[PDB]
């Protein structure tokens, strides 16, 4: 299927795995990060004895399979799910073995050392891979953006990373990760819908309402004013049609769901909102480059697909920062895949072909030394 000896770019982002060959502009195999496990034991004869579903095979059946998240906040919980999702991506979709081409994986900023050593060991010992490389997502996203300056805000599913890069310079001391993202928003919407009257307590419905949020939920331009005008609703409340057919009616809750990002007090945490944390990060940077960080801020992550985030960011930053300079916020189209796109354009360079880590040196050095070599 592939006639070019190039690394397979597999972005294992929290919530959605995006795998594809280098050189492509979009991932071909896109599936959620979920593992469905046979709950009961059947006396039936003939069905697949497979004890571990994955991807679309699990999405197609969520009532029988208990759903487990292979990644939580960033820390890898179960490694069997890791081996399952890579083995599946290798021998069920791509139809190619890892013994013929490299593999450029993308990991989140500020992750545990155990996670890195574990994935590297599974990719070297178990699977025969000629070479591995771990890369931070923020750099590849800035590559795909086509710039060298700005602060990347990557909001995945269970973690949110703010990474400032000015004039092509990483700042490992300022990268601050906060576990507020799509899962805590799904939980907030679920508890407020339970407050509305429709109560559910199973994961399949949780994924359904997550999809409903992805499709409908947006960000408000003025929270309190929308609350007041929605008190007497007319066009502000919408009636959604569940894929099963049950008629759901959702009004203001939509534009109050992502608001939890701006007010973490809703989930009883002393952490500051994403905008205030980004602002504090800007103060932690130097003054000289702060204006450039204001003018080149970039966004990444699937959570940014909601309509109305750019305007909300502009008003909040204008209210926090002075209103004398110019603070333009740029969001490139299809930003979610941009990271992966970067991977593709990063795997075609010959120099990058010279910066890989082969098996033998890793085996003698050991995983810890490999951690030192990368950084």
């Amino acid at each position: 299927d592939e006639d070019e000896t190039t690394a397979l770019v597999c972005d294992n982002g929290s919530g959605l795995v995006k795998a594809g060959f280098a050189g492509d502009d979009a991932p071909r195999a896109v599936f959620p990060s979920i593992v469905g496990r046979p709950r009961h034991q059947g006396v039936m004869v003939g069905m697949g004895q497979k004890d571990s579903y994955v991807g679309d095979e699990a999405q197609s059946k969520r009532g029988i399979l208990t759903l487990k998240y292979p990644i939580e906040h960033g820390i890898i919980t179960n490694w069997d799910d890791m081996e399952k999702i890579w083995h599946h991506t290798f021998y069920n979709e791509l139809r190619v073995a890892p013994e013929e081409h490299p593999t450029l994986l993308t990991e989140a900023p500020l992750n545990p050392k155990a996670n890195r050593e574990k994935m590297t060991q599974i990719m070297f010992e178990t699977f025969n891979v000629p070479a591995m490389y771990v890369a931070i997502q923020a750099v590849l996203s800035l590559y795909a953006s086509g710039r060298t300056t700005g602060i990347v805000l990557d909001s995945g599913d269970g973690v949110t990373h703010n990474v400032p890069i000015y004039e092509g310079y990483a700042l490992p001391h300022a990268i601050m990760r906060l576990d507020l993202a799509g899962r805590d928003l799904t939980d907030y919407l679920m508890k407020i819908l339970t407050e509305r009257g429709y109560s559910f307590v199973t994961t399949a419905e949780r994924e359904i309402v997550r999809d409903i949020k992805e499709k409908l939920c947006y960000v408000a331009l003025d929270f309190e004013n929308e609350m007041a005008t929605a008190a007497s609703s007319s066009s502000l409340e919408k009636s959604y049609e569940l894929p099963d057919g049950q008629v759901i009616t959702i009004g203001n809750e939509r534009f109050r769901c992502p608001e939890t990002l701006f007010q973490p007090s809703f989930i009883g945490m002393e952490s500051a909102g994403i905008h205030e944390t980004t602002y504090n990060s800007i103060m932690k940077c130097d003054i000289d480059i702060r204006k450039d960080l204001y003018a080149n801020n970039v966004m990444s992550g699937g959570t940014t697909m909601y309509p109305g985030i750019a305007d909300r960011m502009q008003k909040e930053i204008t209210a926090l920062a002075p209103s004398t300079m110019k603070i333009k916020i740029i969001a490139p189209p299809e930003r979610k895949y941009s990271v992966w796109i970067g991977g593709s354009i990063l795997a075609s360079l010959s120099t990058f072909q010279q910066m890989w880590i082969t098996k033998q040196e890793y085996d003698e050095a050991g995983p810890s030394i490999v951690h030192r070599k990368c950084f």
């Binding site: 499709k215 947006y218 309509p307 109305g308 750019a310 305007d311």
Partner: protein
């Protein structure tokens, strides 16, 4: 014969309804994006007018 005809008409209607729902979701998304673009364009227009006035001053 009539059961075969019913099955074919049902499959046709199901396909049409699926495509129609996909078109509807796309329409909403594109309409929200267009509304946002119109609002932002209006802001840029008023801002550029204000900046031309400031240039004269």
């Amino acid at each position: 014969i009539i059961e075969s005809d019913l099955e074919r008409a049902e499959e046709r209607a199901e396909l049409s309804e699926g495509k129609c729902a996909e078109l509807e979701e796309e329409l909403k998304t594109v309409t929200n994006n267009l509304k946002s673009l119109e609002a932002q364009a209006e802001k840029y227009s008023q801002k550029e007018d204000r900046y031309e006035e400031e240039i004269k001053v």
